[PDB]
């Protein structure tokens, strides 16, 4: 009863075609949906559905028996290994010494690589007399019999109890190795090794095998720290050692919240004199305690200076956008912005001052983009958003547009472009002039209204017309029906133009009609009227779509050569930068780039750059006067300050630019207060032990994510951005089952690690239904067991409208208290020293209290009373009450006011507080902290905390000695001052 051979034996009785559906039906679905609920998600298999149900029902009732058992499918036609060691010794040398019997000899001394593998050097000779000669491989078996491997996680969050392990490999066959393995000490984390003594231990490795030696460390400081293990063998002369770098990340999540963005322009705005502009400080009502914050002030001399400078540099082009790129339109970062950037620089003749050498680099970037984009192509030149999906009309037309715009820069194959135009015109355009879309919706303007969907055809047809407006003389001999398609599309747009209710449709349709010269009269009036405040085309509830609509409308205005309605639209488009200096989605950044770039077609009485921007920063001691001029290599200047303040900026002179004020801080792990346009629930539940896990894994758990759209229709494109907990990684088997099976629930996964905090897992969803919850679950494996784990984040957001989001956090929440790594040793007292002062082992006198209290840093000395205790899984909050200010600090506080002290979780057991007990506490002016509620004293290495026994219990033996000392302390700190 192996029940695997039964499964495969039953699979072997279906036709070879349409045979995968029974295989995927036999699979254990991790999101344990019944057969009839999985047959709802199967796409194209009509006979497959019945087959999927037949086999699913089968194996499911064969699983109802037998409570070692093997229940995995044995598949076929899959190659196993890749990632072989990188090649080296790639050089061209020649022989030019006198030959010996016609054979020249040259000796070349080389350095072997640090890899344990069998290299095989291949040689080829080319002689201009005796021709060519391919040599035999010279096999070099590089081997080492004692090799030490250090296993540490990807990143560890501060104050976590992780157990790294040093695996020792012994390949000696006749010898059982006795070796002394030692962990070196680093003051940046509490290890079993200190400065007082080493942590060296003697172990014995069996022959032809390994041994794992564990070390538990507690990171105390954020940054890249050195984990170094030394191994010295106890018999031979082999001494090996490993020194790896472990990065320790802060306790929250990184945020680059945009403080404000202000258009720097003294001529059209700022009236008399010149423009003054106040910039507020940041919110930071949730900044993680004891974390730094950096404010980057960015001065763009022109509206499109940073976007170009980033579009040229390779290792900076992907910083324009805060969302991943794993789909047909998203990948277009590799082309579009670099394309319009190079064109903007060509039209304005700026490569001379900027640097000619970079142009070709940009072109190579475009080449790479083009290469990447070719991966989404189907037969007959049709582009789908994801492989194994129906080709989309919108994406195909958009790729046509970008490619036809790119034929000027790099070599674009006319077969793909022309075949795509042919696919669009011939297959997707109906004699109605309407373009059909038989794929899932990508843009939320592609789905339109329901009972009347007239505008649904309007927006798509206008977009495809904009696409074909730039492939006029580029692709025509292959597809000669471009004037007729433009005719029919423009006719459908110009006929049903008075049926448009949304401002986006009006915008993009107006630009499509203006490109042909058909925007005039009632269409012109109707178009310009909808613009609210005559500087933005917007709809409530769709935020980035308003940036797109304003961009398309600006292109319509520049197409009509109208130079009156533009400056307000430029001022509005320049101040929509919400996610860093750039924008959220791809389409927003692209269209704003195109429009703001094409406002500088020529210089027809247009503003030339010569600004005199002075900034009075409170953190700095003097004014800061930046002067960016035209005909300068860098139209960009930036400064950085490590203190968050609200500074005043004063622009002057002639020139229109941008002031981007962005900060960087770490927010706490609290779930979203108000989730705008998304419902999201995340739960994590442990998996059974007997259920098999990978070998290196220690514990396996199930992660379940359930989301729902709150809109009137289904969401069009959604991202699940899951940041893993420390030491965790997803099970790629389940991800493969969900992304590639017949019952599809995931478009594709990524695991796109950008080297920021913990590694992320991006999941792509074609849609999120509003009629139900799109639950999906998968296994997560903990390869390093961690205690005091800080929770992980799961942020959902719509790709083309980032304000539709919901950020939730998940945690196992183990029961009633904290299980840490065994605290008996000094490894623990070391960790607990960090978060509150240390007492001399009950040898505490009031004279000592006076010393430590009369330190020059001691700003406040309070007598608190523990009112409330709200402890979380990342930071415990003690809502205290001041009963008497024995020494008030730099912050005014009244007797009886509450102050909420924050403490790290790792210190909870070290403090062991009880509610409604008196306490003596003191600290520094640095202990005060900026949050709201304005109750922020961080209990740190300088915060004295001691339980004050009440008057009724001073009649006990262990208390009176402390009571009298505390009273003498109080009066000796009120009546008598400090002499130090």
């Amino acid at each position, epitope marked *: 009863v192996q029940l695997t051979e039964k499964r495969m034996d039953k699979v072997g009785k279906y036709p070879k075609e349409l045979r995968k559906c029974c295989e995927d039906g036999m699979r254990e679905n991790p999101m344990r949906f019944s057969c009839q609920r999985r047959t709802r998600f199967i796409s194209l298999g009509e006979a497959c559905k019945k087959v999927f149900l037949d086999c699913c029902n089968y194996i499911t009732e064969l699983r109802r028996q037998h409570a070692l058992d093997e229940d995995i499918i044995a598949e076929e036609n899959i190659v196993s290994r890749s990632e072989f060691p990188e090649s080296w010794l790639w050089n061209v040398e020649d022989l030019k010494e006198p030959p010996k019997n016609g054979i020249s000899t040259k000796l070349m001394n080389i350095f072997l690589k640090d890899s344990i593998t069998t290299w095989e050097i291949l040689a080829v000779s080319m002689s201009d007399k005796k021709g060519i000669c391919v040599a035999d491989p010279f096999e070099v078996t590089v081997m080492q*019999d004692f090799f030490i491997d250090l296993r540490l996680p990807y990143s560890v969050v501060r104050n976590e109890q992780v157990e790294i392990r040093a695996v020792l490999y012994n390949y*000696r066959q006749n*010898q059982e190795l006795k070796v002394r393995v030692e962990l070196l000490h680093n003051p940046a984390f509490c290890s079993l090794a200190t400065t007082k003594r080493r942590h060296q231990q003697t172990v014995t490795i069996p022959p032809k095998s390994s041994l794992s030696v564990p070390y538990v460390i507690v990171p105390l400081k954020t940054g890249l720290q050195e984990v170094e293990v030394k191994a010295a063998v106890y*018999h*031979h*002369f*082999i*001494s090996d050692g490993v020194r790896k770098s472990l990065k320790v990340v802060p306790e929250g999540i990184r945020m680059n919240k945009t403080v404000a963005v202000r258009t720097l322009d003294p001529e059209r705005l700022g009236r008399e004199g010149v423009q003054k502009e106040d910039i507020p400080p940041a919110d930071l009502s949730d900044q993680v305690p004891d974390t730094e914050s950096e404010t980057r002030i960015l001065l763009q001399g022109t509206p499109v200076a940073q976007m170009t400078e980033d579009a040229v540099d390779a290792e900076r082009l992907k910083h324009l956008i805060v969302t991943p790129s794993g789909c047909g339109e998203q990948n277009m970062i590799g082309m579009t912005p670099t394309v319009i950037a190079v064109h903007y620089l060509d039209e304005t003749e700026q490569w001379e001052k900027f640097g000619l050498e970079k142009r070709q680099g940009a072109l190579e970037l475009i080449k790479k983009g083009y290469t990447q984009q070719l991966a989404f192509r189907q037969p007959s030149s049709a582009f789908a958003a994801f492989v194994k999906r129906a080709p989309s009309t919108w994406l195909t037309a958009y790729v046509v547009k970008v490619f036809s715009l790119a034929v000027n820069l790099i070599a674009i194959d006319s077969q793909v472009l022309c075949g795509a135009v042919k696919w669009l015109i011939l297959e997707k355009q109906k004699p109605d002039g309407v373009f059909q879309e038989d794929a899932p919706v990508i843009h939320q303007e592609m789905i339109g209204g329901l009972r009347n969907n007239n505008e649904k055809d309007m927006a798509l047809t206008a977009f495809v017309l904009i696409s074909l407006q730039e492939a006029k003389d580029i692709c025509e001999e292959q597809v000669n029906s471009l004037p007729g398609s433009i005719t029919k599309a423009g006719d459908f747009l110009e006929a049903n133009y008075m049926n448009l209710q949304r401002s986006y449709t009006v915008a993009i349709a107006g630009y499509a009609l203006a490109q042909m010269g058909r925007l005039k009269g009632p269409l012109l009036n109707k178009f310009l009227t909808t613009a609210k405040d005559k500087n933005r085309w917007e709809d409530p509830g769709k935020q980035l779509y308003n940036v797109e609509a304003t961009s398309y409308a600006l292109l319509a205005l520049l197409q009509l050569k109208d130079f009156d309605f533009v400056p307000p639209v430029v001022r509005w488009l320049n101040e929509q930068r919400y996610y860093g200096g750039g924008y959220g989605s791809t389409q927003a950044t692209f269209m704003v780039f195109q429009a703001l770039a094409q406002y500088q077609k020529d210089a027809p009485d247009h503003q030339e750059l010569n600004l005199d921007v002075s900034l009075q920063l409170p953190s700095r001691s003097s004014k800061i006067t930046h002067r960016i001029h035209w005909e300068s290599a860098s139209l960009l200047r930036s400064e950085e300050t490590k203190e968050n303040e609200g500074f005043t900026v004063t622009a002057e002179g002639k020139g229109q630019g941008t002031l981007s004020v962005v900060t960087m801080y770490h927010a706490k792990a609290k779930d979203q207060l108000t989730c705008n346009k998304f419902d999201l629930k995340v739960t994590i539940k442990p998996a059974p032990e007997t259920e098999k896990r990978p070998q290196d894994a220690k514990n396996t758990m199930i992660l379940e994510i359930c989301t729902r759209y709150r809109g009137d229709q289904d969401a069009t494109m959604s991202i699940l951005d899951i940041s893993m907990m420390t030491g965790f990684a997803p099970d790629t088997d389940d991800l493969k089952q969900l992304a590639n099976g017949v019952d599809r629930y995931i478009s594709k996964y990524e695991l796109d690690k950008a080297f920021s905090d913990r590694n992320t897992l991006i999941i792509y969803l074609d849609k999120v239904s509003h009629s139900e919850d799109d639950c999906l679950a998968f296994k997560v494996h903990q390869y390093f067991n961690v205690e005091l784990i800080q929770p992980g984040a799961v942020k959902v957001y719509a790709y083309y409208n980032l304000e539709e989001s919901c950020t939730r956090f998940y945690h196992p929440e183990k029961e009633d208290g904290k299980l840490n790594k065994l605290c008996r040793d000094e490894l623990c007292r070391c960790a607990e020293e960090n978060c509150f002062i240390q007492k001399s082992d009950d040898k505490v006198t009031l004279e000592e209290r006076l010393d430590k209290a009369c330190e020059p840093g001691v700003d406040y000395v309070y007598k608190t009373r523990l009112v409330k205790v709200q402890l979380s899984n990342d930071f415990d909050e003690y809502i205290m009450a001041i009963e008497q200010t024995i020494k008030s600090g730099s912050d005014e506080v009244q007797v009886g006011q509450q102050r909420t002290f924050i403490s790290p979780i790792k210190c909870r057991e070290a403090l062991k507080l009880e509610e409604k007990k008196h306490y003596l506490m003191w600290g520094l002016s640095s202990d005060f902290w900026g949050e709201k509620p304005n109750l922020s004293y961080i209990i740190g290495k300088d915060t004295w905390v001691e339980h004050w026994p009440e008057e009724d219990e001073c009649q006990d033996e262990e208390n009176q000695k402390q009571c009298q000392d505390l009273g003498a302390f109080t009066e000796s700190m009120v009546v008598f001052g400090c002499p130090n």
Partner: nanobody
Amino acid sequence: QVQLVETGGGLVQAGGSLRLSCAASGSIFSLNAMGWFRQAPGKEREFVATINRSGGRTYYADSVKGRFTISRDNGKNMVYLQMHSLKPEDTAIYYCAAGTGWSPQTDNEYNYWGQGTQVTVSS
């Protein structure tokens, strides 16, 4: 790789002393084990002394436990074997051997050897 040339031997008095210098023709660093071996006529290839890559760890055979002292100067690429309190039974051909670092007391883990030098201790 490296080849070795031994010198400093010869004939010596019954209880005198002499130092054997082992010259290397390459790089002596990264050579974990550097060992002196002797072979007397009518004897198996036996072990004398080995020194670590930086010194400190020294292995000696019981027959020369306190009478001999092996040293090395990595800067000059030289290994030295000082022989104090000689015995007539020490008459042998003393070789200098480059090794791997594995099991230095045995002679199977030394892939490079020298020429040798004759030391005759007359009674």
